[PDB]
Every structure is written in structure tokens, then in C-alpha cells.
């Protein structure tokens, strides 16, 4: 088992973690702020997913300071995790291209 593949897995596990913790923390942070919509777990989990992937439709988003802070962690964990997979794929292509180079 290579580091990049182990890193991919780990990245995926930690991301699913951030998503769950993030969903829980967003609701905890938004309830109390009038006009807030990120206030029930099911949709918060949906919000966290569309945030980690950067799709951000705009149907949901935090309006409080703590919610936004939670949002930042989720964005970063998502961007960074997916970028990690990209780097793992680059390593896999490079390694095989060297082989095919008989190097």
C-alpha cells in the first residue's frame, strides 16, 4: 500500500468526518439567529456536502460568525481532500510513465 493511496483513503475518511461534525456544528451555530435556514441536520448535511465540493447552489448558507467559521473548515477540508486525490492520481500516472520509459 503506497502513501498516496493511503493518503487518499485517510483524506476521504477525515472529510466524511468534517462533513458530519460540520453539519452538527452549523445547526448549533445558526439556531438563535433570526432568518437563519441552516437549522436542521438533514439539510445541514446536504449544505456541508455542497460546500465541501464548492458547488454552493445558494439554497443554504450560514449567516452567523460561527457558522461561517464552520463553513470555512468544510470548504478547506473539501478543496484540500479532492486536491489530494488529484495528486495521488498524478503520482500514479508518473510512476507508470517512468516504467513505460523503462527507467
Amino acid at each position, epitope marked *: 500500500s503506497a502513501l498516496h493511496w493511503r493518503a487518499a483513503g485517510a483524506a476521504t475518511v477525515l472529510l466524511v468526518i468534517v462533513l458530519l461534525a460540520g453539519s*452538527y456544528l452549523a*445547526v*448549533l451555530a*445558526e*439556531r*438563535g*439567529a*433570526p*432568518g*437563519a*435556514q441552516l*437549522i*436542521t*441536520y*438533514p439539510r445541514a448535511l446536504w449544505w456541508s456536502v455542497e460546500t465541501a465540493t464548492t458547488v454552493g447552489y445558494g439554497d443554504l448558507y450560514p449567516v452567523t460568525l460561527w457558522g461561517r467559521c464552520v463553513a470555512v473548515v468544510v470548504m478547506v477540508a473539501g478543496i484540500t481532500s479532492f486536491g489530494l486525490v488529484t495528486a495521488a492520481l498524478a503520482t500514479w500516472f508518473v510512476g507508470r510513465e517512468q516504467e513505460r520509459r523503462g527507467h
Partner: antibody, heavy 118, light 106 residues
């Protein structure tokens, strides 16, 4: 079995204060929120506030005068609502309800009848 | 804060008729509306969640419909046991709120 247990009544002198309780049973998830609702005779349902025991955070209906203070005892699965310095306007039936964090009140207590009088 | 308007505060129907309760929101709230029944001296009881989802243990007689700002709670074929107060509640934005309620009369 009864998921939320509330005392039937509490008599309180104007100016004084009381602490209502709401003991719970059945499934309890970290995502549960306990709500409190006020109902004056004849009138409708008024939301007072909520509390999430697993964290202890509490929010209140900022539309009305803050008479309550919510707390919870994780160990005995009991939520408490302290009403302070009451007047006859505070006389009413006070309900507690459990929401699984998905927006609706799946279950309600029988409610505690509070009467403010000398 | 979201305002919930329950039209005729009182509704009169003959035994067996189909009856419809109205609930209107001051702004669009998707399907995040719930209905409760409260009989004389009883505590509220969930009947419909999310505008039209059935609740276990509730007569098939009851159903809900709508989305956006207009919601309806319907009772197909009214009967004595349905005499009570009916309330809607929203969970779309924060201060969860209740409608003023509608009394059913047969």
C-alpha cells in the same frame, strides 16, 4: 411509554419564581432539542425557547420578554425551565416537546399548569 | 420572523364532509410546515409533517398539501373525534413559529 413527564401544576406568588421540569424517556440522540411552549387559556401556542442537552446551548423567542432560563441535566435526562418574577400574565399551561433536530415536535409533555396568585 | 396565518379561525362542516384547513406563510418556506391536533384539555399531537408526510398512527383520513406559502390540512369525511383545534408550524427559518389555529366544528 410516556416520552416526556411534566408535573401537573405549580402555584407561584407574583414576583416569585418557579423551575419546571420535563423528564424524558425513549430514544435520546445528541441531536435532540427540547422545546418549551406557552399556552394561555383560550389563546394559542407560543414558542418560548429551546435547548440542546448534549451541548447545553439555549436560544429564546426574542419576540417576548425573557422570563425563562433553560438548563438540562444530561445524567437524569431532565430539562428545566426557570421562570422568574412572574405576574398573572405568566399564568398558563407550559409544555415541553422533543424535536429530533428536523423541525417538528414529534412528542409533547402533558404540560404544567402554572398559576400566579397570592 | 415568519408569520403563519390560519384563515377562518372556525370551520363548520356536516358529518362525513371533506374539510380543508388553510395555513399561509408570510414568505416562501418550501415544504417545512407541520400540523398538530389539540383536543379540549389535551396536549398537541403531530398529524402531518413536511406539508404532506403521513405520521404513523394517524387515521388515513388526514392528509396535507401545498408548498411555498399556501398549505392545506384535509380531513376526508369528518367525524366527532376530529373536533379540536388545528395548528400549523414552520421550521424553515429561525424563530420556529405557530399559526393562530383553526377550530373544527361539526
Amino acid at each position: 411509554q410516556v416520552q416526556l413527564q411534566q408535573p401537573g401544576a405549580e402555584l407561584v406568588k407574583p414576583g416569585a419564581s418557579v423551575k419546571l421540569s420535563c423528564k424524558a424517556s425513549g430514544y435520546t440522540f445528541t441531536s435532540d432539542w427540547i422545546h418549551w411552549v406557552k399556552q394561555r387559556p383560550g389563546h394559542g401556542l407560543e414558542w418560548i425557547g429551546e435547548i440542546i442537552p448534549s451541548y447545553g446551548r439555549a436560544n429564546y423567542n426574542e419576540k417576548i420578554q425573557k422570563k425563562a432560563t433553560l438548563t438540562a441535566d444530561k445524567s437524569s435526562s431532565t430539562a428545566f425551565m426557570q421562570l422568574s418574577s412572574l405576574t398573572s400574565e405568566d399564568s398558563a399551561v407550559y409544555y415541553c416537546a422533543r424535536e429530533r433536530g428536523d423541525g417538528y415536535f414529534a412528542v409533547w409533555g402533558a404540560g404544567t399548569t402554572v398559576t400566579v396568585s397570592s | 420572523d415568519i408569520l403563519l396565518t390560519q384563515s377562518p379561525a372556525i370551520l363548520s362542516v356536516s358529518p362525513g364532509e371533506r374539510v380543508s384547513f388553510s395555513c399561509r406563510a408570510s414568505q416562501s418556506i418550501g415544504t417545512d410546515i407541520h400540523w398538530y391536533q389539540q383536543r379540549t384539555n389535551g396536549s398537541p399531537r403531530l398529524l402531518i409533517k413536511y406539508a404532506s408526510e403521513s405520521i404513523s398512527g394517524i387515521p388515513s383520513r388526514f392528509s396535507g398539501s401545498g408548498s411555498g406559502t399556501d398549505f392545506t390540512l384535509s380531513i376526508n369525511s369528518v367525524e366527532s373525534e376530529d373536533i379540536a383545534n388545528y395548528y400549523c408550524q414552520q421550521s424553515n427559518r429561525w424563530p420556529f413559529t405557530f399559526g393562530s389555529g383553526t377550530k373544527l366544528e361539526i
